[PDB]
Design an enzyme around this catalytic site. Sequence first.
Site, short mmCIF file in Angstrom:
data_model
loop_
_atom_site.label_atom_id
_atom_site.label_comp_id
_atom_site.label_asym_id
_atom_site.label_seq_id
_atom_site.Cartn_x
_atom_site.Cartn_y
_atom_site.Cartn_z
N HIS A 12 0.75 -1.24 0.00
CA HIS A 12 0.00 0.00 0.00
C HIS A 12 0.78 1.29 0.00
O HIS A 12 0.14 2.33 -0.18
CB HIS A 12 -1.01 0.04 1.16
N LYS A 41 -4.52 -9.99 -7.98
CA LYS A 41 -5.29 -9.38 -6.89
C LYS A 41 -6.24 -8.42 -7.56
O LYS A 41 -5.81 -7.58 -8.37
CB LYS A 41 -4.35 -8.68 -5.90
N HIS A 119 -3.89 -3.23 7.67
CA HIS A 119 -4.87 -3.48 6.65
C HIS A 119 -5.41 -2.18 6.11
O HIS A 119 -5.65 -1.26 6.90
CB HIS A 119 -5.96 -4.38 7.21
N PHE A 120 -5.64 -2.09 4.81
CA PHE A 120 -6.29 -0.95 4.18
C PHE A 120 -7.76 -1.28 4.01
O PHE A 120 -8.11 -2.24 3.34
CB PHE A 120 -5.65 -0.66 2.81
N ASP A 121 -8.64 -0.54 4.68
CA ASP A 121 -10.05 -0.85 4.67
C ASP A 121 -10.83 -0.13 3.60
O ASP A 121 -11.68 -0.76 2.96
CB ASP A 121 -10.68 -0.58 6.05
#
Length: 124
Positions: A12, A41, A119-121
């Site tokens: 990210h 992905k 984590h990227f939400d």
Amino acid sequence: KETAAAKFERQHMDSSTSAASSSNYCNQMMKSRNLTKDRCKPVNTFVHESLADVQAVCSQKNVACKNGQTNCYQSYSTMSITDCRETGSSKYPNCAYKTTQANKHIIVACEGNPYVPVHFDASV
């Protein structure tokens, strides 16, 4: 193995550029960061800010994650982001992506000590 924090950086963070500068950005970055090694992905976001500014989000506005967990945080400021989404012509191993550049608030999940993004939400 790779830590969750390190995986977040690899997936990210792109502090080396201020914005995507061509339509090929996502194709190049998804490949170079090893996100297409086992499968394409389907979606991924890159953040064009310093690492420290993104880590600092873990001290900002606490919100529920999309799945209901309560360890998510929303940035006070907008950030420069690039969204990468698989196109209809993508076919492993030649994974293909559309690049979209935007300025949005980010939502990350944080864990650990030091308390860092894992984590990227979402972007909003």
